Each structure stands twice: as structure tokens, then as C-alpha cells.
């Protein structure tokens, strides 16, 4: 679907943006535009990929004119620019509002003005039953995206969103913490052995975005079905992959869709599709055993490498 | 404490603003300013109170210059301007952000610039564990109020907030609607019989706002303790008072089954101050508070004049 | 001409907006959008009409983005959002400028951007020979609308306006004040018995807007011809309909800022206006008042009063 | 009253601003700031006056920040920046609103923020019974000025206004047209000989602004009493002064409305309209002799 | 190329705008819109040309809505609105930025929204190697114009620029000063006799704009090749044409902030420039200045001066 | 002059900002506020320094309200927020204008409104005889800083600036490239052997800012005198140390050099030629002593 087309990714210097580049840079796509504020991160990527298809635009989604110019001639937009950290959003909620909410309004308005064909907005499980300023701002962003998706019937723009939770082995998460502790001979620090988390990789997320991109109608929100595991099972599976069963250990659920969303949702195989108008959480989804957890971990390249005595990040 | 002071109420044409006028207009306060957008409502209100202490300002809290201008020479502000209806905010969430969040940032910034001494912001229980755009926007508003309340260490401005739920015998609430349905001989329309609500009056909310006004520290949020009841117990108690011993519809979209005034997180830091909790800046809900039975519910209803009028 | 079309009324929760719904809602129009600021009023309207064709948009004409979003996919706009009260505007003239003038520029620019086919702007007789801030701002609005309409030759947007004065039995006007005073046994309070007003119903106003809507060219202002009456003759006609011919009347005296006649077209306008039967058309450049129009006697005034259901019920 | 004070004139490059400069530059005022958009006019003016007391600010009254910055440390403001031509305003009424109404709002807000002591706003007779966009916009400007002047009780700022009509020997006005037509041997172009205009000089206008400046209270509008003449009387007196007798050849201006006249204070040479009919037809009529004596106040005519 | 078309000139009340009007007003062009802030200058022009083709718009290029509105139905735009005086920009550099940079951005965005076919932006030699706030701001404008000229591939708008220095017999310049001083028998005031300037008439500038208008691709900057001369040679050629070969000259000294040459293309630009006959074309990605271009001798300088109607008149 | 004061650094997450913290965090200063846009960098710094004196503000200098808010209660500001990369500014000159010029206008205007006492602005040698969008934008910023510094006589705010070039062993500079190229076994990639650069460390840069902070008058720009070296002498001295045996920058224009005050180790350009070819040239021995000021170099 990307042949001779132009894709723009807001927040493209982030982990998502990189995942998308690695998949698409050497395909038949014409151009990938990276839109973000930071010139150092953009320079590093330029050198890392050394690809003529990769165009970099300095800009801020808070700035309508900026995004309006970057989206001239663009076919598709992946909207991933956000403030995503909990403490900074707690202390500067206006900043979260300006970026996540007003920023989102700008990209969509620019997309509509420039006749962009498709826009996918990335959202988080923290938006379902939100408890802090970051989560709240993402919940508000969804509401905004859905309202904006109305009246585009004559026009040729489809806007929809995807929602996913934390991905395995992202920065400062449990898996790289456990791996380090095992490498350093330290006991694993475990809060609650029975705390459950959804388990999905960064590749799975890219697939979720690709699915929404192909199948979405205005205002749709897609969620990918994901299995879950307890921290107990995660630690056990990891000690077995790294050959340290005889290794010391020292001693609550996330939701992807609310009850309300569940009653209206379409089950579409590996995805739920929530059309615009029990909970689905890590406790009641498919539970992984150690063997199934080991298969998921082995989808991480740094972990495959460890079982060979190789070390990469 | 209001003697010869100037009070400005944003959203002053609403039910809150009226309750505040009825209490304070004929006391020793120098001036009450009503700041809102609607010329019709202001005109009606002006005729109703016909008081020289009552000054009217047309303006929108979305307009910084406008609120900056009206708060020149003001000592205290009750910030009550909001979009508060659920369906309206769901279909227009940007309007809720512009009014509830950005509008609040404007009022607070104007207050700081004009050396206003105290501001109390009104919030709702729907901001706790919010599930709809209205509640989400109010939750965001609380965070902004709190964040703005820091760095005022040099300045002589105090900002705090209050949070309360639905009041009994309000314009479009359950009690006058049930009475109205009976007057028309129709069965009572109930969404969820097992739904609990805090039972509280407009008078109590004014007390709550006055309480925060006297005692608040920067970033404080006050909540008033109240008993609760199911709509079932409420409907039953009202039928007994009216001597006429129901249609169950469904739980409506974006409507919880209980109201929450403090989250689990807040409950941990909150100070219990007798009839109020005080949440300082940086679980308590209608399900686990004092539950009223038909007898307890009746003794409350008989304190409401709108009900007294009907039993007499 | 409205079949399967989308109409948006800015200021749609007002009396004009309601008259338009009562006429068009149950016709073959596709959708009517109401655009205004107050959620309370919109909610009442929604319950009142209970129609799937009626869509509500919260927004302010001061906000370009807001009206730009509400007019996407719209065919026609009736622009009726205004601040119209005289005392309120004298103390806050910037608010009048912001809503009446800048708000009008916003709706028109949005209309041009969303390729809306026709926009009719509602104006008032107070724009003719204006003496106060409300009136001054409405005069400026007409000029802004007219200037905006001289830019559209490449585009498929037509912009024009209508001008009319108060409608009979509007809120806080003379007729319901008299009816009330009669019901409560009080003498009728009259300021100046010889004061004349144009006599015109709310249905007549909808017809005027429809006329402009059908026949308007860029920058036109349309005015509907109407008879007038003194308050004396109005009071007499009403007392007879209510069978209270000998009911006292109190001559209070002339109010601050209340004229004795209204003008619908100025002398300068009459020189250029085209007589088109029941309407005048003032073309854009690129005296007609209540004293000298057709004067009604009591019998004529009674036939007009009987057009109001509010009065019919009383007989 | 200007001793060691700072005066800012918006629209200072105009004919009024130059009249004020000619008057005040060589007094004990500390500084006169000229605030306007045109670098050309400001440069010529700098060269013409070659004075260290004369400071120039490029800026637009539509730009709040610009005027906020230019008025830091200013004691007094004469607000004279406006769009004034009638045809220009009919075709671009938004520019008139932006400059005359919103621009004025900015100057007053800037003056209030910077604690400027006095602001006098210049207005026109075309604002009384306005019939066109230029006049309507000036009428709006007065209402805005008056409304802003309420709430200054805590503050030490006084805002008021002046209103006057066309001045004699201004550019493209009646006198230089008649002078030019005689120079070119052409007959005098008269629309209506029986139409009356107030007769007043540029120096008189400067006096009017100084009067309001000294005596004004919040929201006051001052008007200067002036005699009037028919264009007929004007042509004759002018033909006689130039020794070219027997040479081939609204309808009045109003300075106070009926409503204002009821509330106005007669203060000798001035009316003072306090915040809440006088026209050229019914004011003192000049005959040919009185017109000649006025025309001789123009040095331009003496030659 | 102007038949039945609509042309808009920002800054149309200035000297360039007049030269374009004198040239095109009485041709088959449909309409010329003059867009500027000053009602006085516009009224003067209106009377001067008395042409039904000449339409006036009040507005500021700093105001996006104003220019958006003025360019509806416009085919071509000559963008000549600027703040161009050196002292003025030094004390208010923000005003230079607001008008020259943000104003240019507004005009270009308006042109794109209204589907204007071509825009030519006028720039100055002071943008090459800029040393003061006026020049610095004009350099920024070119960068902004070039950057905006990208991504218009789908759209049917072309944006390009021209750069030129002072033209002969413009206001407050050397020639009308010398001509006046001669008529009053006063000696000619010369700062630095060896200072070289490019020699180029107002008509040449119009041709340069017309050329850029016909030939430009997005982001192009055109420069017209021009010979140069010293003030010494300028004074001598003029003294001979006016028949005052024996006319006193006062050497004041080199003036503050006045260079001895102007540059039209930098070394870096010359490396990338295309030679197109009478013009250089710098595409969007030796120094070329008045010292190293063709020197005019007195005789060749006479032939240039004789192109001015103002000078031809005096030899009669 | 820092005792119990509040310092705010715009762009505080940069290499300069980190240098200032390393120096001042554990002194008797009351508070250091870091104002920048990036939550990731701010978080890492919070973790790295773990100090209660270090406050973080998310904000953009393009946003007047944001900077107005973070400067409430601030005594001194180091304005170091900029876009400084050349290609990036060539393709996006409006972003350079918005951040470097309008952003600077916002900081000073907020500084004035909140009665900040002293503001020092950081500028670059590329503002002298500028040739590309980044440099042009910085030159404009100086003009804006200087113009803003007039009219402050009544107010208790002083604004001034500093200008310096690339510092030794900065990211993507000549030195770490040479070290890395030996590390990857390739001979060193040299553009022009004869090209001169001023030779200066990050610590010297902090001193320059401290100097301006102590001595600045309204509209002043300070430059620190520094020696220079050929790329040859730079390359040669390092190869001896490592045991493996345009073309100049300008700091003051001819125009500035005429009015500049010589103040010992600094030039002070008051409001209204000095380059790397004609400054003190280091030989291999002098270059050796300078390279040894880098801990990055000492360690090897
Ligand atoms: N593990 C996950 O990846 C995860 C989990 C749950 C939800 N999500 C959601 O998926 C989205 C993508 O997440 P991510 O992991 O890729 O986050 P990320 O790594 O932090 O990337 C965010 C990027 O957004 C850019 N950005 C921030 N503010 C901007 C602005 N005002 N204008 C333009 N660009 C701006 C930043 O680039 P610059 O600093 O260069 O400007 C930043 O690199 C997020 O919105 C997130 O809520 C992700
Ligand atoms: N059950 C309850 O009533 C309840 C419960 C908990 C908390 N609260 C909170 O108490 C506050 C007010 O209570 P309420 O019952 O009196 O609400 P209300 O009756 O709806 O009155 C709100 C007022 O705000 C004004 N307003 C809305 N938008 C504005 C704007 N953009 N600028 C200026 N004024 C604006 C409206 O007046 P105009 O239309 O004239 O502009 C309206 O009169 C609300 O913030 C609400 O969240 C209410
Ligand atoms: N060799 C040199 O690098 C050199 C030499 C002389 C002078 N200077 C000047 O000194 C400063 C550079 O210092 P530096 O190199 O140590 O830091 P830096 O690495 O260049 O980073 C500067 C910081 O500015 C922040 N920033 C960028 N745009 C911003 C904005 N719009 N609002 C708020 N913050 C913003 C960035 O932080 P976030 O991404 O977190 O927002 C960035 O970390 C610049 O002014 C530079 O021109 C540099």
C-alpha cells in the first residue's frame, strides 16, 4: 500500500518511528518524512540510516503552520508525537495539554487541509480509566481524534487510532531490569509476583498500526489482542533462557478496553475494532505459562543474542 | 471576611452563582461582579436582585484580556464557569478543553497579575476516575489549578479548589423530575436502581465553597463528607412522603454506578478535618460512605423546602 | 432547493432559529445544524423537537476554528448570532465588536473556505442611522459583509443580508406587556402614544430570509415592506380583541434612548434601492420609516394581531 | 506641565503630530516619542527637526507588544494614529476596525499597563451621526475609549478625547483646491454653495488637545466651538484676497448630537461632554469680511 | 504573458510599483492590485493614473487574513513590500523581522492557499554578505522564500526571487543630487571617488522582474548582469553631458557604513550559478561585485545616463 | 554573587547547561532552574545529579506564557536555547527564526516583566560575517538583544551577551573524530591542513559567561581572547600524545574591533579585525598543554 507514496511520521525520532523505518525504508515507498523538534536526534538518524528516502523536518505539532508545511504532498500520517512521561506531565499539565491535545488537533486539521489520505493516531492503555495527567491527556486526545473524524464524508481523509500498552524491553521497563540483575549476579527485585501485564513486542505494535492503516474507518480505534503473564512467570522464563535457575529472588493489572467499549467492539481475529459512536484487561486475557513466555522473549533480538553468548542492547 | 471586599464570580448566572448571591448580596460586601457571556441571563438576574452592589460584565473566560479587565480591583474570585453537560462535551471535546482547561488557566493568570487575594475553583466528582470528556476535562483543570498554585511563594495570591457531586432538588435532577413524573401520573424513570449518589444540597455546596475560601492553602482541594443512597432508596422514600406506591431503563453512556470524591491515591494523603477532607497538593465514594435507608433518606428529604411544600 | 441539503444557523437557539425549525425540520431538508454557545439551550431544543435531522454544535463565532469545523459539508448558512441588547453593549462595546463584527468576518471566511453556497446575514433596523454601540456595531457588520462579498467571482459562494426590526410579541416587547397588564387588572403602560413601529410577524421574518436566500446577489441587502401603527392604535386593537375596550391607560412618558419611529432604509439607500414588489433590494456599490409607510387603523391592526397564536388563544 | 516629561504621539508623522512638534520641541519637555509605521516619513522628520529631544519608534498600534514597548517610561500619550479617508474605509472596513477600534484598545491597554498618566484620543465630527465606515469606526472608537475609562479608580491614568472637523489649509481640502484652480485658470468647483463647514485652523486643534490634556476627567470628550461659512462665502472672500473677482464658478458638519447637547457643559470656548444640536448650519456664521480675516491666518494665503 | 490576467503588487506604492504601472497599465492586462498600508499614497496614485484597471487594497503583509483576502482571483504577485532603511532596522530589528521575514512568509502562504500561479520576490544586494539588521533580514527572507518553494510539486504555484542593487536616478541618490548641485552652481559633494557601484536603470529592474517571471523555477534567484563605475567616472560623464566640464568637486571623505563596492553574488553562489545570457540564475540547493565586473569608462557611462529621460531633457 | 539566588538556564539540558551545573550545584546558590522541551533529557539529568536545588521546567522559548511562568522569582538567566546546526537551519530557516530570534525576544520580555536582574545571552562566532541561515539567525538575535537593552534605565534589569566558537572535544568536532579514527585504525580524515580554529575548552566558555555576568552593561557583547592552531598543529600534537607517528573563524568584525574595549583577557563590544588566522598561534608544544586540559585527553 506504500508504493510510490509519501509517509510522514510525527514524533519519528522516538522508538516507534525507528521501528517503522527499519521496516519500510528499503521498500517501494517513495519518501518517509520524520517530523519532530530535535535536531540532534534527527542528525543521528540521518547518519544511522544513510538513506535517500528519509527526509527530516524540524517542527513542533503545537505549531499549525509548521505541520501544515511538512504535510504538503503527504499521502499518509502516523501521529506519534507525545509527552508520555508521568512526572513531567503531573508538574506541567498545560504542556501535556498543548502537545497531546492541541498538537493532535493541529495535525488532523493540517491533514484535512492538505488532503492527506490516511492518518493513524497512536494512543495508550493508560487512556482507559486514566489516573494521572499523562493518561488523562491521552484520553482527551482520543475524544478529540474521534470528534475530528466527523464531516469528512465528502473529503478524502480517513482518521482513526490505535491503542497499545507498554512494549517488551522498552527503556526502563522490567525485562531489561531483570536481564541486568541477572548479568550482575543480583537477586531480581520483584514487587508483586502476581501482577499481570500484557506482553507484546515493538514489531506487534507496528503491525497494529499497519492494520488500522489498511482497515480503519473514520473514528475507529483498534486494539491488538495480547496475552498476559505474571511477573513470577516472566522471571522464571527469563532465568531459564539465561541459564540461571539456581539464582536468588527478593519480594496490578492493565486494561486495553473498558466494559463500555467491549459491548460495542467488533472481534476481528487478532484485533478489536471499537467504532466511534467485562473489561479487557491483563488479568482476564489469555494467560501465558513459562513455555509460552519463553517463546515471546525469544522474539527479542537482544535476548536471542544472549542465549548465544552475544551482547547487544 | 467579606466586609468591604470585592467578589467576582465567573459563571455567575448559573445555579451556584444564584445561591451565592442569595446569601451574600445584602451583607456588608462592597460589590459582587458577575462575569459570564450571556446578555439575556444577566439582564434577568439584574432585574431579579435589583441591587446596586451587583455589577455585570459580559465576557468569556476563553478571552484573557476580558477576564484580566474584569478582575482589576477584585479581592476574591469564585471560578464557576464551565461546560458541564456530558453529551455536549462528548461530541465537542475541544470546547470542553477551551472552556474548562484553557479558560481556567486564563482566570488564574489574570488573578495572579491583578493581585487577587484568593481564588476558589469549582470541580465535580466526575473528575475522579473520569470516564467521559466532561470529567476528563475537569480532571485536567484540577491539575492545572494545582500546578499554577506553585511559584506563588513570593506573591500574595492563594488558589485552591472544591469538588462536589450532584445536588438534590437542582433544576434538572432526579428529585424534581420524579415529582414532575408523578404530577403527570407517569411511572418513575430510573437508569440503575443500584446506583448510589451522595445526598447533598445546594446550600451545602455553598458551605463547601465558603469553607475552602476560609481555610484553603495553595493547591488544596476540599471535599465535603456526605451520606449516600441508591436511587432505589431515594425513589422509595419519595413515594412514601408522597403516598403513591417504576420503569427501569439502562445505565446511560458515560454514567458510573457510584460517585467518587477521593481516589485511592488521594485518600492516602488526605487530611480528615471533621466534615471535610482536605487533599493537599504536591478510597472515598458513594458506595462505601454512610448508606441511608428509607427512614434516613426521608429525614433528609424533609429538610428540602421543595419537598416540604408538597407534603403541605 | 433545500431538498437533501444541509443548513447551518449560527445563533440557532434564538427566536429566529426556532421559527426556521418549525418551518423546515419536517421537510425534505437533509440536516439542520444549530451553532451556538449555550449547552442548556441546545439541550432544551433537542428535547423539544426530538428530530434526527437536528444536529447541535457548541461553538462561538469569535472562534474561527470552531465555525470552520461546524461548516464542513454545509450548503447554506443563516447567520443570526449577535449581541442585540442596548445597555449591555454600551458598557461593553468591545464585546459587540468582537461578536457582531469579527464574528461575522469569521463565519464568512469559514463559508468561503468550506465552499458553502449561500450565506444570508441577519441585520437590524438599528443599523440605519445608528446612535448607540449595538447599532453602530450592526452597521459595521453590514459594511464588513458587503466588503467581503466583493471577492467571490472565481468562487461559488454568494453572500447577502436582510434587515428587519422587532417582530410582534417578541420577548419583553409591548404586546405581551399589555396582555399581562390586562390579565392582572393594571392600566396599560404607554411611553408615547404617537410612537410608530413597523408591524411584522416572525413568519414574515422567515419569509424575508427565504426571499434573500432565493434572490440575493453578492452584497445585497433586502428589506421587507411593512405597515406601521402607533402604540395607541395597537393598544386599542388589542383591547378590542380581548373585549376590554374601556381599560385604563397610563401615559408614562418617553424613555431615554427610545425614538418615536424606526427607519428601515436611509435616504441615501432609497436613491439606489430597487422596488421589487414586497421588498426593497439595496445593491452594493462596486427615506423609508415607520412614520411614512402605510399607516394601519384599528381594524387592520386587529387582523395582524390575530396572526399571533398567543393572541388567538386569548380570544 | 510638560517639564522634564515624556510625551508619545501615535500617528506622530501626520499633520497634527508635526503641529505639536513645532510647538513643543523647543520647550522644557524631556522627550517626544513619535510612534508610527512609515520609515520614510520618520526619516524626513528627523532631518527636518534635527533635535535630540525627538525619538522615533517604528511600530503599529495594532501590535500590542510594539505599543507596550514604546510606552515604557512615557508620561503622556496623544493618540492620533488612524485611518481617516472615506472611500478607503468603505472598501476595507475591517482595516478601519483593526486600526481605529482595536488599535485604540491596544494603546489604552498599553497605557494602563505602563502607568502612563494621561492619554488624549483624537476623534472627528464624522463620528457624530455616522453614515459611513470611516465615521462608524470612529464612533466605535469613542465608545471603546469611554468604556475603558471606567475602572481606573485604583489606577493613576486619565483617558479622555477630543473631537474636531476638517481644518483649513489641510491637504486636498477646499482652500488649496480653490487656490490651485485659480492658478490653472479653471472655474471654481462648487457642489453646493449653500453648504456650511466649520472654519478652524491647525493651531486651534493643538489648543483643543492641550485643553483636554489639562482639564479632562475620565471619559470626557471636548469639542471646540468654531464659526462656520458657506462655500459661497468662502469662495468670495478668497476671490477678493487674491484679487481675481468675477471668476467663473452631507451638507453640514455636526460636532455634538442632540443627545450630547443635553448633557454637555458649556465651558466658554469648549463644550465638555461628560461620560454617562450643534452643527455648522446653526453656529456663528461668517460673512465675507470675517472669512477674509480667517484666511489671512494661513501664511499659505498671505503670499 | 499578462493578457486577461490579474496582477497584485505588495508594496505597490513604492518606486518599483510605479515603474511596473507605467509599463503595464495601458496593455491588455485585466487588473493591477496595489496592496499597501498607506491610504494617502494610494489616493495620490489613483489620481495620477486615473485608470479603471487599477484597484487598491489597504492591508499589511504582517496580516495573513488581509493578504489572503486580497489575493483571491490573483494570477501573479510581485512581492515588493519591505522595510529597507538601515538606521530604522538597527533600532527596531524586530520590525524588520516582522515585515521582511514573517511578512514574506504570509504572502507566500496566501499565494499557495489562493492558487496563485507565480510569485516573484524582490531582494537586494545588501542581502549578500549582510552586516547590519536591514541586510541580515533580507538574507533571511531569501532563505525563507527558497524553503517555502519546496513541496509545491503537486500544486500549480511557482515561487522565485530577484536580487538587485540601487537603480539609477532613484530618490535621495547621487545623480539627482549632482544634477541639482549643478543647476544651483554648487560644487558636487563626493565621498569616495573610487567607490564603484553597479549601473542599472529602473527599466532594467522591471525587465529583471519580468524575466524571473517568465523563466523561474521554484527557489530560483535571478540576478541581472550589470557593468559598474566609479563615482569619479559618474561625475565626469555627467559633467560632460550637462556641459559643465569645469565644475568644482568637494572630496568629503569616505562615509560611515558605506562600502567601496556592492556585491550581487557571493563566491559560494557563483560556484552554483547558471549563466543565462543577460542574467545569472542561482538554483535552490570568484565573487561577483561592482569592483570586478565590467568597468565603464566615461564614454560608456554617457550612454547609460542618456537612458534617463531626466538626463536627456537637460542636454536640451 | 550567587548566594541564595535563583538561576534559570534556558536550554539547560545542553553541554553548556551541564557544565554550569557541575560547577555551581553544590555551592550556596538557592536554586537552579532548567528550562527546555525534552522530558527524556530532563529526566536523565534529574537522575544524574540527584540534588534538591535542581528544578525542571518543561517549556519552549517560543511560548511567551511558558517562559513568563518559569521566570517568576528568578534573579538571573543564562539564555542558551538555540537551534545551532547548519544543515537543519538551511532547510528550515523559519524554525531558526522562531527559536533563535522570536524565542530570544520572548525570554528578554519575560525577563523584564518578572524583574529578573541579569540576563546573559549566548551567541556564536558564526554570527560574525554570517553566510548561512544558522549564522544569519544568530546575528539577528544579537541585534534583537541589543535593541531590547535600550529603555531599561528605570527597570532593574541588565541584558548582555557573549560570543564564542566551537569548543574543544565537543560533539562532532575535530578532536573526537581524530581520536575515533585512530581507534578504528583509519588514517585521519582532514579537510584543510592549514585551516585555523580558535582553541578553547568548555570551562573557558563558562568563565566567559561568568565574566559577562559580573561585568556586563546593557547591550554589551563579550568575547574571550583565545589562541588558535592550524589543523596541522592540532593533528600533529595529538599524534605525538597518542604515539602514532571557511578556513578561519572570526570573533569580532572590523566594525566591532574599532569600538571594542580591551579588558585584558576579554574584548567588550559596547552597543551603538579579530580572527583565528591573526590571533596567537600555538606551536605543537603549546597545543600539547591545551590538549592536556581535556580529561578526555588526559585519560588516554
Ligand atoms: N513503549 C511504547 O513505545 C508506547 C507504549 C504505550 C503508548 N505509546 C504511545 O505511542 C506513541 C509513540 O510513543 P514513543 O515510544 O515512540 O514515544 P517516544 O519515544 O518518547 O517518542 C516521542 C517523540 O515525540 C516527539 N515529540 C514530542 N513532543 C513533540 C512536539 N510538541 N512536536 C513534534 N514532535 C514532538 C519527540 O521528538 P523530539 O524530541 O525530537 O521533538 C519524541 O521523540 C506515544 O504517543 C505513546 O503515547 C507508546
Ligand atoms: N450539579 C452541579 O450543578 C455541579 C456539581 C459539581 C460541580 N459543579 C461545578 O460548579 C460550576 C458551576 O456550577 P453551576 O451549576 O452553577 O453550572 P451552570 O448552571 O451550568 O452555570 C455555569 C455558567 O458558566 C457560564 N459559562 C459557561 N462557559 C463560559 C465561558 N466560556 N466564559 C464565561 N462564562 C461561561 C455560563 O453562563 P453564560 O451562559 O451566561 O456564559 C453558565 O451560567 C461548574 O464548574 C460545575 O462544574 C456543578
Ligand atoms: N560549539 C557550540 O556548540 C557553540 C559555540 C558557541 C555558542 N553556542 C551557543 O550556546 C548554545 C548552545 O549551548 P549547548 O551546545 O551546550 O547546548 P545544546 O547542546 O546546543 O542544546 C541547546 C539546548 O537548547 C534547547 N532548546 C532548543 N530549542 C529550544 C526551545 N525552542 N525552547 C527551549 N529550549 C530549547 C535544547 O533542549 P531540549 O531539546 O531539551 O528542548 C538543547 O538541549 C547555543 O545558543 C549555541 O548557539 C554553541
Residue numbers in the entry:
A (entry chain B): 1 to 251, 260 to 285, 306 to 341
B (entry chain D): 1 to 245, 249 to 285, 307 to 336
C (entry chain A): 1 to 286, 307 to 335
D (entry chain E): 1 to 249, 259 to 285, 307 to 333
E (entry chain C): 1 to 285, 306 to 336
F (entry chain F): 1 to 245, 259 to 285, 307 to 334
What does the paper say about this structure?
We describe here the characterisation and crystal structure for one of these, the enzyme Ab-WbjB, proposed to initiate conversion of UDP-GlcNAc to UDP-FucNAc. Like other dehydratases central to the biosynthesis of deoxy sugars, Ab-WbjB is organised as a short-chain dehydrogenase/reductase (SDR) fold. We have demonstrated binding to UDP-GlcNAc, indicating Ab-WbjB likely to be responsible for the conversion of this substrate to UDP-L-FucNAc as a biosynthetic precursor step in surface glycoside formation.
No density attributable to substrate could be identified in our structure solution. Importantly, examination of the Ab-WbjB hexamer shows the NADP+ associated with chain A to additionally interact with the K40 side-chain emerging into the binding pocket from chain D, i.e. from the adjoining dimer. A reciprocal interaction via K40 of chain A stabilises the coenzyme bound in chain D. With six coenzyme molecules bound across the hexamer, these hydrogen-bond pairings recur across all remaining protomeric interfaces, so linking chain B and chain F, and chain C with chain E. Given these interactions act to tether non-dimeric protomer units, binding of coenzyme NADP+ can be seen as integral to locking-in the hexameric organization of Ab-WbjB. However, no tyrosine group occupies the required active site location in Ab-WbjB (Y141 in FlaA1); notably this position is instead occupied by a methionine (M134) side-chain.
